[PDB]
Structure formats: structure tokens, C-alpha cells
Ligand code: SF4
Ligand code: SF4
Ligand SMILES: [Ca+2]
Ligand SMILES: [Ca+2]
């Protein structure tokens with residue numbers, strides 16, 4: 009079926025899934041049970057951005073289902089697909105909100121799930137200064153764990169934040185990637201709906217930094233499209249639900265690139281089969297220009313490795329501290345004393361260690 | 363009370379001046395014609411010999427059923443239709459034939475030369491002419507010889523463009539409508555329409571289809587391709603449209619007609635230092651060159667020359683009293699201009715021995731010395747500024763900006779901007795094909811056509827274009843239809859937010875183009891066939907499988923009939939704003955608007971209401987999308 013009916017199918021599936029879990033919350037916890045996300049002043053960001061209304065109980069969460077229904081208009085026109093994509097996003101938030109209601113601890117390690125408001129504030133400044141050039145939203149499954157780790161480690165090397173959702177989390181673990189908020193690689197969850205918490209990062213950035221008010225959907229979608237440098241990288245087979253999420257990402261102005269054959273849309277939905285080119289395509293697709301310094305060193309160099317916790321067992325050499333004498337200094341001298349690029353390692357080297 | 367004459371305020375203003383001046387216009391002569399013969403309007407009147415004239419009944423079962431020879435209404439109507447196609451094909455045939463002869467006389471230190479060498483190298487490949495280590499002029503002459511053969515070769519096979527899908531060629535072959543030499547097919551239709559020859563509606567209509575193909579894929583194509591070789595391939599360029607382009611204190615030289623060689627030489631002549639100084643000697647600021655109809659489109663596309671107006675505006679241009687010289691060549695030149703120019707100082711100069719108009723200054727265009735001949739004609743227009751009556755001059759202060767030069771090469775270049783360097787391929791129509799399959803753009807329509815007093819001037823053109831772009835259908839325009847849009851202001855980048863739908867506005871912003879693309883003159887409709895062909899070939903389908911359509915909201919010329927016919931025979935549905943004379947032939951109506959679909963995958967649609975036409979185009983496109991699975 010064509011791209012439109014594929015999006016409408018996945019959006020209707022997302023509505024059906026949200027209708028099922030919402031009923032479970034009504035039957036188990038009642039319509040008065042409080043619904044809320046861990047540490048957030050915007051209740052359910054997506055619903056608060058679209059309607060400007062805050063959802064506080066299961067009964068109000070039930071009413072939010074009508075927002076998903078209203079956004080799905082099965083007419084073949086671009087504005088209708090994008091609205092259908094947002095219906096998938098609202099449904100994903102409803103499902104994720106009900107997950108926290110029906111479970112004391114819905115997320116298991118290494119998954120993070122909902123991202124707290126202070127973390128959004130923490131990443132806001134580095135996004136503005138360009139320290140975080142982009143946010144790579146990787147979803148799906150790669151042919152092997154070697155390709156998944158090469159792509160993550162490359163994005164992390166560029167300092168782009170990398171958010172993983174699906175089997176790519178298991179593949180990255182096997183391929184030895186260093187995950188963590190400071191390491192700029194955050195695993196959200198295995199379910200497709202877990203991608204909504206990154207969407208909330210972009211929406212909350214418009215409310216927090218952009219200073220946009222709730223209900224101003226057109227203004228929030230403009231902020232994410234022009235200011236939040238995000239893009240999606242969907243690997244492995246794509247289900248109808250995943251394609252609807254892709255339409256939701258496109259609605260926020262984020263291009264979606266996939267290794268699977270799909271009906272392409274220039275500068276929006278693209279298809280790259282070569283994994284060794286994926287990173288370069290994604291950056292070009294979202295106008296992310298990386299200022300490469302090109303230092304001649306055998307190890308990586310990026311802002312993600314800041315505040316590294318090199319502990320005793322994982323360490324080989326130690327200098328300074330209440331252990332040995334260490335110092336640093338910068339001097340001003342004439343052109344005669346300085347011989348431009350000159351590296352002289354007086355004393356023993358790390359090879360001498362045993 | 364009385365129906366409006368036009369939707370353009372500049373046109374309406376000069377029409378009032380024409381009444382005050384006491385001159386007659388095409389709109390006035392339309393009223394004088396009063397009720398038009400129904401027999402002729404239904405196509406049931408035959409004059410193909412001196413046994414008549416015969417006139418059978420358009421309503422079957424009553425009145426006279428057959429002609430003196432025995433021809434039924436369906437036979438009479440089908441032959442009448444055929445002859446219009448054969449006449450339309452002939453107009454474009456001589457046009458391209460002249461261009462090819464010019465290509466055969468190109469030289470490195472000559473008046474006519476090859477400007478686009480790359481295009482010539484590509485065209486030479488299709489005609490099987492070698493290019494490796496050879497003079498560009500030796501290649502140009504061999505190409506011209508191969509191109510000229512397509513007009514009258516009696517043995518062998520004709521050379522067709524590469525953009526034409528093999529599925530479309532095989533369909534024509536099996537249907538028995540594969541094209542032969544250009545002039546040969548015109549003779550074939552004229553022979554079979556003769557008394558006592560063909561008396562079968564289906565066979566006759568198939569003969570017109572075969573003939574019309576020699577226009578679109580041969581006469582027009584070669585006319586367009588060779589014009590781009592000698593005068594340059596068009597590219598995105600800016601210009602002003604409407605009668606407000608004329609300047610009161612400058613010499614106004616209006617070029618009307620269709621032949622591009624004369625207009626290309628009058629442009630170069632306007633840059634001769636002696637002529638620029640002669641204009642000042644007479645008391646003018648400079649030389650203000652303007653165009654009208656095709657010849658104007660062909661110069662605005664390549665050199666950004668300003669457009670004075672379309673078909674029905676040609677008389678009102680003289681009424682401004684500012685046209686010093688009106689140089690005409692051939693086709694769509696109303697003979698009334700000879701009588702009208704007498705009431706003003708305007709000089710009506712005819713140049714082609716093909717179109718001689720009585721009581722007009724005749725200055726033949728010497729093709730041997732083209733630039734010198736062009737300078738002699740332009741000098742006469744400059745000197746005529748001395749007889750301008752500045753007190754009675756009235757140029758409405760109404761002009762509009764426009765962007766054109768959207769050739770297939772240019773459209774591909776602009777589409778490359780939305781291609782990823784690490785993934786997408788380059789210099790292909792893929793971005794357009796991708797947007798159509800995805801559904802962002804519901805389809806692509808081609809609004810072409812003339813001006814007819816049966817329709818409010820430009821009314822159906824604008825209403826049709828507007829409705830299509832609003833429904834996410836990218837619109838391409840040519841001829842008077844393109845000019846109608848240029849005058850209104852649809853050929854602007856800002857027209858996307860103002861009128862385009864959600865998807866088309868997005869594509870317009872990404873590719874950086876207006877929602878309406880001016881592809882050139884009516885001969886340049888071959889570029890539309892070329893574009894639709896590349897999309898079909900790239901997707902591995904026939905042209906009938908794509909969500910594409912053609913529209914002629916206002917049309918008159920027999921060229922529009924041949925155009926419509928080859929567009930439908932090529933697999934593209936066509937909507938007609940003016941009803942052709944087929945009403946009286948029930949079998950012919952069924953063939954044209956129904957059975958034809960079973961033969962070529964496309965059909966004709968007659969709809970005078972433009973609002974109903976856009977509804978039908980969208981519904982039809984969707985039907986073809988659902989069949990294809992897009
Ligand atoms: S010749 Fe025919 S179309 Fe003309 S006025 Fe006579 S009946 Fe009518
Ligand atoms: S060909 Fe037949 S219908 Fe036509 S004028 Fe002659 S007798 Fe009449
Ligand atoms: Ca050709
Ligand atoms: Ca321009």
C-alpha cells in the first residue's frame with residue numbers, strides 16, 4: 009500500500025493500542041488514579057503542546073484518546089499525513105503514561121524511559137552553543153552488532169546525542185559501546201512507543217527555551233523544525249506503526265532515513281543501504297556541519313568523554329595526586345625559543361610500564 | 363448584464379479606449395457573428411466536394427441522415443475532425459522544418475551559430491550522427507540532414523526521442539498508429555478525407571492519431587531541440603508581463619508570430635550601436651522590445667524579453683497608440699491588424715512569404731543575411747516613432763513579474779538541490795518521480811491553450827490553474843495559457859504560499875520554484891512530453907499509468923486540436939474548455955470521450971466549467987494512482 013494508507017494504518021494501530029492499555033488502567037487503578045511522568049512541569053508534553061491542557065488522572069488520560077482520534081483524518085493530502093503522524097505521537101505518550109500507572113518500575117536497566125526536565129535544561133545550553141551538533145534517534149535493528157556500534161561510536165565521536173530505541177540497545181551492548189547521559193548515548197526502551205520521550209525533549213525545548221506557550225502547536229512544531237537538530241535512523245524491517253512514528257518525526261521537521269525500501273520524499277524520507285555512508289547522509293539531511301580538528305592521535309577525542317571515571321582497576325598509569333609530583337605550565341617566548349610543531353618526551357614512556 | 367470580455371483590468375481598460383476611438387476588436391466581431399451555424403458547430407456540415415454543400419441532422423433518427431455521397435453524420439464529423447489535426451500538424455511541421463534548415467546553414471563566423479554544443483552532442487546520438495573528434499558545425503549539418511529526413515522520408519524507419527517509453531511505441535505499433543514522415547501523414551489524412559475514401563469513424567480517428575504523433579514527437583520536438591541548440595537551452599529567468607510593459611518615451615517594437623529566428627535577430631539588432639543612437643536621434647530613451655504569443659515566449663524564455671500579452675490582446679496592444687512597429691511572421695496573427703493599424707501610426711510589417719496580409723508593409727526576412735535583414739526592419743520601426751501622437755497614447759500602468767525558462771534540463775538542475783550527495787543519483791527526474799509516488803504531489807497537470815471569445819479571456823485559464831495547484835497538482839504551462847498566468851501573477855515564487863496546497867507549497871519551498879512552471883511556447887509542449895516520458899521510463903511504466911493530465915481551457919487553433927490528439931495518443935488524458943465540432947457524431951463522441959481509453963490508455967474530456975474540470979482531473983488522477991498502487 010502507498011505511504012498515506014501505511015501511515016493511517018499504523019496510526020489506527022497506535023490508537024487501538026492506547027485504547028487497550030487505557031482500559032486496563034481504568035479497570036485496575038480506577039478513573040481517579042493520578043497519572044504523571046517523573047519530574048516534569050509540563051504534565052504530558054505532547055498533549056500539553058497540542059492542546060495546552062494538563063492530564064492529571066486516568067479519567068483525563070481517557071479523554072486524551074479523542075485527541076488521537078481527531079488528528080487521524082484519512083484523506084490523501086500532506087497536511088493529513090503529518091496530523092496522522094502526530095496522532096501516533098499522542099497515542100505513544102498515552103501508552104507510555106499508562107505504562108507508569110500500571111507499574112511501579114516500568115523501565116529496566118540500561119533503559120532510561122522518561123527524561124526529566126533538569127536533563128532537558130542540562131542539554132539546552134550545549135545545543136545552543138553547538139557542542140551537541142545533532143540528536144541521532146536510532147530505532148530498529150541492524151544486520152549485525154558490528155555495524156550498530158560503528159554508527160553509534162561515530163555519532164558519539166561527532167558529539168551528536170544518540171538515543172536508542174528497539175533491538176539496537178541489545179546490539180550496542182554486545183558491540184561494546186559506552187552508554188550514559190554524559191557519554192551522549194541514552195537507551196530509552198525496547199518498545200516502539202519509547203521514541204516519544206525524545207519527541208518530548210524537542211517539544212519541551214520549545215516550551216522551556218523557546219518560551220512558547222501550550223496550545224500553540226504550529227509555533228512549537230516550527231521551533232523543533234528550525235532549532236532542534238534531530239533526525240531518525242530506522243534500521244531493519246519497518247512496521248506500519250514505525251512508519252507512522254516516522255510521519256510524526258517528519259511533522260516535527262526531523263528527516264527520517266532508513267536502510268529499507270520505502271516511498272521516498274526528498275529532504276524528508278530517504279533510503280540509505282550503505283551503512284558506511286549512513287552517518288554522512290544523516291548529517292547532510294539535517295544540515296549538521298561538523299568542525300573537524302583532525303588531531304593525529306590513535307584514540308577518539310570528543311565532548312562525550314568529558315568527566316571520564318578512570319578508576320583504579322581500569323587504569324594503567326597515574327600521575328599527580330597524593331602519589332607523585334605533577335605539574336603544568338604555559339610560557340610566553342620569542343620565535344627563536346619556539347620550534348613550531350615539536351614534541352619531546354623527556355623521561356620514560358608508558359611502554360616502560362609493566 | 364452582458365458577459366465580461368476579460369478578467370484582466372489592463373485588457374478591460376483598453377477595450378473602453380477602443381470603443382471611444384471607434385475601432386472594432388475580436389470581441390465586437392464575435393457579437394456581429396450572432397448565433398453560429400449549428401450544423402458547422404456540431405460538425406455535421408460537409409464541403410469535401412461540389413456535390414453539396416451537405417448538412418445532415420445532429421440529432422439521430424430525424425432530419426436528413428446521409429450526405430449526397432452517402433456519408434453518415436459520424437463519417438462527416440470524423441473527417442472534419444481529422445482535417446483539423448492535419449492542419450494543426452502542418453503548422454508545427456513548417457515551423458520545425460524552417461528551424462532544421464537554419465541548423466543546416468550554421469557557421470562559426472556566421473549570423474546563425476550553434477550555442478549549446480552539449481545539447482547538440484546528445485541530439486546527434488539519437489540521430490546516429492558521430493561526434494568523436496569532429497567539427498561542431500559538421501555535426502550540426504549532419505544532424506539537420508537526419509532531422510529533415512523525418513519530414514519526407516518514404517523508406518526506412520523514423521527517428522523518435524529517447525524519452526518515449528518502449529511500451530508506448532509497441533502500443534502504437536500494435537494499434538497501427540506508429541508515425542511515419544511528417545508531411546507523409548498530413549497527405550495521408552487529406553487523401554482519406556477526400557470524397558469516396560474513408561467512411562469509418564474509428565479508422566478515421568486512428569488516422570488523425572497517427573498524424574498528430576508526427577507533430578508532438580517529431581515536428582515540435584525537433585523544433586524545440588534545434589532551437590535550443592542554435593539559440594541556447596532556456597534556464598530560470600525573470601521578466602515582466604502584460605501591456606503595462608510598453609514605455610511611452612521609448613520606441614516600442616512588438617514581435618508577434620511563432621518563428622524564433624526572426625525574433626532572435628531583432629533582439630541582436632536592438633544591440634547595434636548605430637540603431638541605439640538612431641533611437642535617441644528620433645527623441646526616444648531607447649529600444650523597448652516586447653513579445654506576444656509564441657514568438658514572445660521563445661524570447662522571454664531565452665533572453666528575458668518582456669511579454670506584452672497573449673492571443674486576444676494583440677489588437678489592444680495597437681490601441682495603446684504606443685506600438686511604433688508590429689513585426690509579424692506566421693500563425694495566430696489576426697488579419698484585422700492591417701485595418702486596425704490604419705487608425706493609428708503603428709506600422710504593421712509582415713515578413714514571411716507563408717503569411718502575406720493585404721494592406722500591410724511587407725519586408726521579407728532574408729534567411730541568407732538574417733541579421734542585416736532584421737536591422738532593416740527594426741530601423742523602420744525606430745523611424746516611425748517620429749509619427750507618434752503622444753497626446754493620444756494610453757498604456758495602462760499594469761504589469762506583473764514572472765519567472766520562466768523551465769526547460770527539462772533546467773527543471774532537472776533545480777531538482778538536484780533536493781538530492782542527497784551520499785545517496786541520491788544526480789541529473790535525473792527521480793526527485794519529481796519520488797514526490798509523485800509518495801503522494802505529496804497528487805499529480806502533474808499541463809495547462810496549455812489559446813484565447814476564445816466563447817470564454818471570458820483568461821477566466822478559464824486562471825480558474826483551472828488555481829484549482830489544480832490548490833489540490834497539490836504541480837502545473838506546467840505553455841503558449842497563451844502560460845502568458846495568462848504570467849499576467850495574473852501565478853508565475854512567482856510567492857504564489858506558492860498564496861495559492862498552492864499543503865504538499866505543493868512544501869515542494870515549491872524545497873526546490874525553490876513557483877507553483878506554475880512556464881515550459882515555453884506551444885512547440886515547447888514537446889518538453890512536457892519529454893518530462894512525462896522520463897518519469898514514466900524511470901518508474902518502468904507507460905505514460906498512461908502516471909497521474910498526469912493536459913488541459914486546454916480556452917482553445918481555437920487547429921494546432922490545439924493536433925496537440926490534444928497527440929497528448930491523448932501519448933497516454934495523457936486531455937480536458938477541453940471549448941467543445942470541438944463533434945456533438946452531431948454520436949460514434950465520434952463515444953470514440954473521443956470513451957472507446958479511445960481502450961486503445962491508448964487515455965481519453966478526451968469536454969468540460970466548459972473550470973471548477974468541474976479540476977474536480978474531474980483530480981478524481982481521474984486518483985483512479986490512475988489507485989490502479990498503480992500509489
Ligand atoms: S456551409 Fe455549413 S457550417 Fe457554413 S453556414 Fe452553411 S450549413 Fe452552416
Ligand atoms: S463528400 Fe459527401 S457529404 Fe461531403 S459534400 Fe460531397 S456528397 Fe456531401
Ligand atoms: Ca529528436
Ligand atoms: Ca530567477
Ligand SMILES: [Ca+2]
Pocket residue numbers: 725726727728735736738739
Ligand atoms: Ca528585409
Ligand SMILES: [Cl-]
Pocket residue numbers: 789790791792896897900
Ligand atoms: Cl531521467
